[PDB]
Amino acid sequence: ATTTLTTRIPTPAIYPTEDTEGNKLTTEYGYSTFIDHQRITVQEMPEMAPAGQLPRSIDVILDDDLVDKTKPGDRVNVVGVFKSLGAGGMNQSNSNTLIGFKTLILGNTVYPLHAARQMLTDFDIRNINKLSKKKDIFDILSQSLAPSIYGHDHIKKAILLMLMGGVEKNLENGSHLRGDINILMVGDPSTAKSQLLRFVLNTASLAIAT
Amino acid sequence: SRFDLLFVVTDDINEIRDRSISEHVLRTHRVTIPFLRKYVQYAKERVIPQLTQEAINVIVKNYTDLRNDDNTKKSPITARTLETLIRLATAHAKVRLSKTVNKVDAKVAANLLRFALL
Amino acid sequence: EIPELVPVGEMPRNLTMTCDRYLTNKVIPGTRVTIVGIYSIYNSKNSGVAIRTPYIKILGIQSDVETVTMFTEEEEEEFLQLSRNPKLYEILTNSIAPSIFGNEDIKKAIVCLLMGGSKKILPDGMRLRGDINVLLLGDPGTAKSQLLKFVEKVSPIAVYTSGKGSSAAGLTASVQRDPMTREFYLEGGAMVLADGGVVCIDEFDKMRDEDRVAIHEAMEQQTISIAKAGITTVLNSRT
Amino acid sequence: MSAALPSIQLPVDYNNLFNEITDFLVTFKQDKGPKYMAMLQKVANRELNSVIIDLDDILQYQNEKFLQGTQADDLVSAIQQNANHFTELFCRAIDNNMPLPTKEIDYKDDVLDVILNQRRLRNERMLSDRTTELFPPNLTRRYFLYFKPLSQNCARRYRISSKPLSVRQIKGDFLGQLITVRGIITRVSDVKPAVEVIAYTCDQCGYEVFQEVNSRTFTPLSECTSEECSQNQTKGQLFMSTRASKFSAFQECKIQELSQQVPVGHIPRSLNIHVNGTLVRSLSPGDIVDVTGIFLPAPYTGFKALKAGLLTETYLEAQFVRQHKKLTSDVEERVMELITSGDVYNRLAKSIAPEIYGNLDVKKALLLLLVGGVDKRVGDGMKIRGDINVCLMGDPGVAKSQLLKAICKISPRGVYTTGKGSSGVGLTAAVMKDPVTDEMILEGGALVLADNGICCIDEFDKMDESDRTAIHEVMEQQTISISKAGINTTLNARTSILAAANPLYGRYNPRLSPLDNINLPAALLSRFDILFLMLDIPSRDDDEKLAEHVTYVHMHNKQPDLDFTPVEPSKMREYIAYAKTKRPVMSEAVNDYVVQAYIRLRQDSKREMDSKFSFGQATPRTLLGIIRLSQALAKLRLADMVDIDDVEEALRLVRVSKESLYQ
Numbered sequence A: 001a002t003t004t005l006t007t008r009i010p011t012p013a014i015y016p017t018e019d020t021e022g023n024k025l026t027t028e029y030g031y032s033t034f035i036d037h038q039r040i041t042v043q044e045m046p047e048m049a050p051a052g053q054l055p056r057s058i059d060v061i062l063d064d065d066l067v068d069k070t071k072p073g074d075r076v077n078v079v080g081v082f083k084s085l086g087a088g089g090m091n092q093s094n095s096n097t098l099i100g101f102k103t104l105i106l107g108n109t110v111y112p113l114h115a116a117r118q119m120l121t122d123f124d125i126r127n128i129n130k131l132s133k134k135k136d137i138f139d140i141l142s143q144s145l146a147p148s149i150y151g152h153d154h155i156k157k158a159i160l161l162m163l164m165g166g167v168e169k170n171l172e173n174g175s176h177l178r179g180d181i182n183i184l185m186v187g188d189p190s191t192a193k194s195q196l197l198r199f200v201l202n203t204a205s206l207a208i209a210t
Numbered sequence B: 001s002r003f004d005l006l007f008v009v010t011d012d013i014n015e016i017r018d019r020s021i022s023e024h025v026l027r028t029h030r031v032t033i034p035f036l037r038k039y040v041q042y043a044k045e046r047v048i049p050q051l052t053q054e055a056i057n058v059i060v061k062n063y064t065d066l067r068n069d070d071n072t073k074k075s076p077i078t079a080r081t082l083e084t085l086i087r088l089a090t091a092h093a094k095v096r097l098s099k100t101v102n103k104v105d106a107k108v109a110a111n112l113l114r115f116a117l118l
Numbered sequence C: 001e002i003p004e005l006v007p008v009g010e011m012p013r014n015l016t017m018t019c020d021r022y023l024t025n026k027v028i029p030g031t032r033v034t035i036v037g038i039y040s041i042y043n044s045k046n047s048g049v050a051i052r053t054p055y056i057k058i059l060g061i062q063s064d065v066e067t068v069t070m071f072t073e074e075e076e077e078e079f080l081q082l083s084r085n086p087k088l089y090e091i092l093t094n095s096i097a098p099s100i101f102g103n104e105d106i107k108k109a110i111v112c113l114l115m116g117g118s119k120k121i122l123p124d125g126m127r128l129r130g131d132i133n134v135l136l137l138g139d140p141g142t143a144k145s146q147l148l149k150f151v152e153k154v155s156p157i158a159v160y161t162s163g164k165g166s167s168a169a170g171l172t173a174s175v176q177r178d179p180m181t182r183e184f185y186l187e188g189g190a191m192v193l194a195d196g197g198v199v200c201i202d203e204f205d206k207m208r209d210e211d212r213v214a215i216h217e218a219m220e221q222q223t224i225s226i227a228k229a230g231i232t233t234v235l236n237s238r239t
Numbered sequence D: 001m002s003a004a005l006p007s008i009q010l011p012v013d014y015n016n017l018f019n020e021i022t023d024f025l026v027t028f029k030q031d032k033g034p035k036y037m038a039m040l041q042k043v044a045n046r047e048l049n050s051v052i053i054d055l056d057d058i059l060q061y062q063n064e065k066f067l068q069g070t071q072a073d074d075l076v077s078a079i080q081q082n083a084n085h086f087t088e089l090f091c092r093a094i095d096n097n098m099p100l101p102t103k104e105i106d107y108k109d110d111v112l113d114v115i116l117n118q119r120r121l122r123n124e125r126m127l128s129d130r131t132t133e134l135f136p137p138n139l140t141r142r143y144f145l146y147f148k149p150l151s152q153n154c155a156r157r158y159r160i161s162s163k164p165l166s167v168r169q170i171k172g173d174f175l176g177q178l179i180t181v182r183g184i185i186t187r188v189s190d191v192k193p194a195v196e197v198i199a200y201t202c203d204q205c206g207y208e209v210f211q212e213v214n215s216r217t218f219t220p221l222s223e224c225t226s227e228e229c230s231q232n233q234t235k236g237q238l239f240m241s242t243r244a245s246k247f248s249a250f251q252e253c254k255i256q257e258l259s260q261q262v263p264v265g266h267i268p269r270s271l272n273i274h275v276n277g278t279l280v281r282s283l284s285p286g287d288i289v290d291v292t293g294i295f296l297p298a299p300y301t302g303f304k305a306l307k308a309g310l311l312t313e314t315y316l317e318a319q320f321v322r323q324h325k326k327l328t329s330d331v332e333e334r335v336m337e338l339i340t341s342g343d344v345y346n347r348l349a350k351s352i353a354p355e356i357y358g359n360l361d362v363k364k365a366l367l368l369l370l371v372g373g374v375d376k377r378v379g380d381g382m383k384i385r386g387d388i389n390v391c392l393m394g395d396p397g398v399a400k401s402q403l404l405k406a407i408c409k410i411s412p413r414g415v416y417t418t419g420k421g422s423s424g425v426g427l428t429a430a431v432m433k434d435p436v437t438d439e440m441i442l443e444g445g446a447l448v449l450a451d452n453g454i455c456c457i458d459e460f461d462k463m464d465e466s467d468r469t470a471i472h473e474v475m476e477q478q479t480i481s482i483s484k485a486g487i488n489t490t491l492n493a494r495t496s497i498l499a500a501a502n503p504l505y506g507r508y509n510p511r512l513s514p515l516d517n518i519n520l521p522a523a524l525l526s527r528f529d530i531l532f533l534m535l536d537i538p539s540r541d542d543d544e545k546l547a548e549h550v551t552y553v554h555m556h557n558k559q560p561d562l563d564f565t566p567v568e569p570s571k572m573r574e575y576i577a578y579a580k581t582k583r584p585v586m587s588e589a590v591n592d593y594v595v596q597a598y599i600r601l602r603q604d605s606k607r608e609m610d611s612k613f614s615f616g617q618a619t620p621r622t623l624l625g626i627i628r629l630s631q632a633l634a635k636l637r638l639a640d641m642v643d644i645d646d647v648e649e650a651l652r653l654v655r656v657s658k659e660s661l662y663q
């Protein structure tokens, strides 16, 4: 059930022995070909499904060409054929209230999307060096982040300082140190402590939080 | 002890402060974002300097005076806080996109902790 | 079963039914409904002699309203003929609650609560929360209780969980083992049932356990994500 | 048969390789005569059962086929194409060129010797007893085969099949080949006898029916199939035989990944490996190793219709292991380096843990306990206390964990632990769940395996409901047991304890009362010997030096300085092990000097009687401990000088360990 299209007569067999001769059959495994097989369930993008239900799911069988491409938590977009398989109603007798038509997708060519791959031209890569020549752009980025809230420029520079990230140089034959940065807030209520916490997730660059 | 920055958000009441607030929420019921996400994700692929004897000479002086002023005042600080004091300036040079740890980065690192502690 | 018709001391029971495609996906949970169909019998082999089970084969749901905005035109004709008469704000306060002596300041708070404001997805990342949430605290015998059953029938979607919190961790989400494939998926909630409308609870003195830690995230941003053993998904909420 | 049963004509045959192994006779004269034939003689005389047929003897054999301009097909081509097919045509080449009666074994001095010849002559005389079944070739081997690839500059000479690929990229055309993979070995099973040959006896004809062994499930045959005991009205009823059935070795293991070449995404996964021949009993849990071996999948033969469609669940088959990273026996030259240079009290103090600032007192308090020694050979039933335990307290910011635990990961048999995991109930051994093999085994924690060593603990406020029992039961001598409903057996207890209790919130207030943050009064003031502290006082000159201390490690990567030559840890380990083999006996003037010491210890402790700073009220349990560490320091610095000056080193340490709080 992998040729994706033609429902051939299956071969309910693993390995044959003794073809029409008196020779003990030998098998060359270097010239025997293989392929892989991986199922993955896809939820619903839980913003455009309207509020009357929990997210649903279906599943998709892909092949070797785009395995290990799918980290759990990626805005993926697949395209394939729609396909049913399995005997519903005859393989057991009396068959009462048992669906026997599994939904499958035997597909191809996934793409990550963004709403890691952003190729830029010579133009924008030069302009970003051209504005790098200014000696103020650390301050402009602080004020151009949260377009709703006054002040807190000590907080505002900290977020962009944390989000971009500091390195950790691992010790050779020694324990590396902390190279992560971990900031904290506290405040009396309704003072925008949770405001700026939700919009770091929109520009997160594949950093999905709980 | 495993965290570094404990920002305590104030909510003090000043008649010019809240008046400025009142219109700015009102003006929004009706330098760009995708350039910003490119700039940081380009700056995760540039080299890391770590190396200038000038910048490391000034910060330890900057530590020692507050090392006299942490214990007789508000909050005791530890040796791992120095690993912040390299790390903020280390990322601050990553904003600069350069391979020389300058002097100017060490001034914003000290001044940011000074509001965080005082 | 509609929980009003056979009271002696019993608990209600339940049936099962199927349908065809050009009448499916026509119901949301939490509604009054009526239905007409057959009472035939299937026999599942997954208990004594050869016994079977009951189920309904439905035919047509000539329901009441949905309680997805398509309807006829003579309904809106009278509505526009009423909305030009500018006496709506004062005439509702007499006509909403025909069993309530006055209470003019409170009564106006309920009609604005039922309809709400809007929602901005304004061209940046963040959002405003377009909703209002009221409280009624006061002495016993001032009709704060029986006023709340009155908003339940008039709402499009309403639930009524008004008592004792009802295990406030299991108010929003529940996961359990499964009879088939032994899995952990999401099933239950009081909020996910009640989107678009209004919930109503009480007793905010003697719940200290989890009732406050369950509504802090559920309110003010209306975006929960369960981090239990399976999924971590941000399901929508506009309660 | 029709419908695409024949294949295309392949140019790669086997008969062209079959005769090319026939010219693996005596011809390789570059590497005293035929060297691979020389190894053939040291197996037939029955002392070793593993030949090694490398690629080096193939490539040099192909090196001197650079001048014979004839058609010789490639060898490392086909043996990476289908590697498993390169052992069965191999053994059918050795038998025509094996010199059999080259050994001399009379009656004994060989396992299974007279009886196989008894069996062979019982089949040889029954080869001509008519006035017939030949041996399958698997019966008379008594040997195995092995392979070994190359990753040396011969690969950079002229041309791959032996790059250390990870598990992650391996699912492609690498199935049915020979690939090596590095990893970390886990889940070591045992060694069980597998079957390779069979012998059924029917006790009528004695004709032992042989068969090849297939996969893990098979079936015996009938009794009316033979040549003599069959074909009549009476047939001998078959059954098995043990001693006439040669059995092999077998052991299963699982691999993981190095956790440094894993990508940022998914978790690593396992893989199955097997053993054959005699590479067995040569792996261990925790071996940072690599195996080279050949690849094949296996059928599942169970519930194959509904489930198990064409799933494969392969393993790899092992061929070679290249393990890595492992007393007056050519090591005495470095024992003399400590004897000639001397310098016990200071250079060894700078040797262990030179990566801190100050604190030479506490780095000296530990090296005496890393040698220990037998307290006293008591003879009679007086099991005396040994192995004193030192605890620490205080809250520095210099990451106190990697101060102590770095000592533990270089000290002998000293196992690391923490608060989570092996708690005080799972500190000893217990019975748990296991896989489908033998369940209810006695899985242990730390103290049933780290006997007579170092129990380096942290996080003393963690899981204390079980831990507070757990610390007393080892400070109490010899009651490490499992007092469960399974058994009531009790094992030994001989291990030292090194504790570091963290304070209460913020700093321990020295102006406040002590024991505000340790919760065990009875475990401390009567059953320990010495304490310390890591209190932080503001001091300008030290901290800027401490500032240069921590900043120096960033611009460079090296930390050493201050005119100390760094010492290898094996040297002091040999010095400890040699010092542990002395055990001097004290004189009389030493016990004369401690009775006056204890009186002067008694009088001043009986002056304060206050709850301000000090602890203890001069127990003899402190008196016996000061005898314990003295002979310990007399063990490490043995010049046979157990005297007043040796114990003057001892009270020198108890006075500086005490009153660490008075600053």
Ligand SMILES: Nc1ncnc2c1ncn2[C@@H]1O[C@H](COP(=O)(O)OP(=O)(O)OP(=O)(O)O)[C@@H](O)[C@H]1O
Pocket: A148, A149, A150, A188, A189, A190, A191, A192, A193, A194, A195, A196, B021, B025, C127, C128, C220
């Ligand atoms: N300090 C502030 N400056 C400007 N606007 C603010 C501030 N605090 C709150 N707001 C406005 O209030 C709205 C919601 O604030 P928010 O709910 O994030 O408070 P919070 O951070 O969640 O506090 P808490 O977590 O204690 O509920 C935002 O739309 C924001 O415009």
Ligand SMILES: Nc1ncnc2c1ncn2[C@@H]1O[C@H](COP(=O)(O)OP(=O)(O)OP(=O)(O)O)[C@@H](O)[C@H]1O
Pocket: C099, C100, C101, C102, C103, C138, C139, C140, C141, C142, C143, C144, C145, C146
């Ligand atoms: N303002 C009012 N107008 C009309 N009826 C009222 C009013 N206040 C109370 N009632 C009547 O009280 C009757 C019983 O209500 P009940 O005594 O249960 O109130 P309650 O629940 O005790 O008040 P509370 O919720 O403050 O304890 C109802 O039939 C209701 O009609």
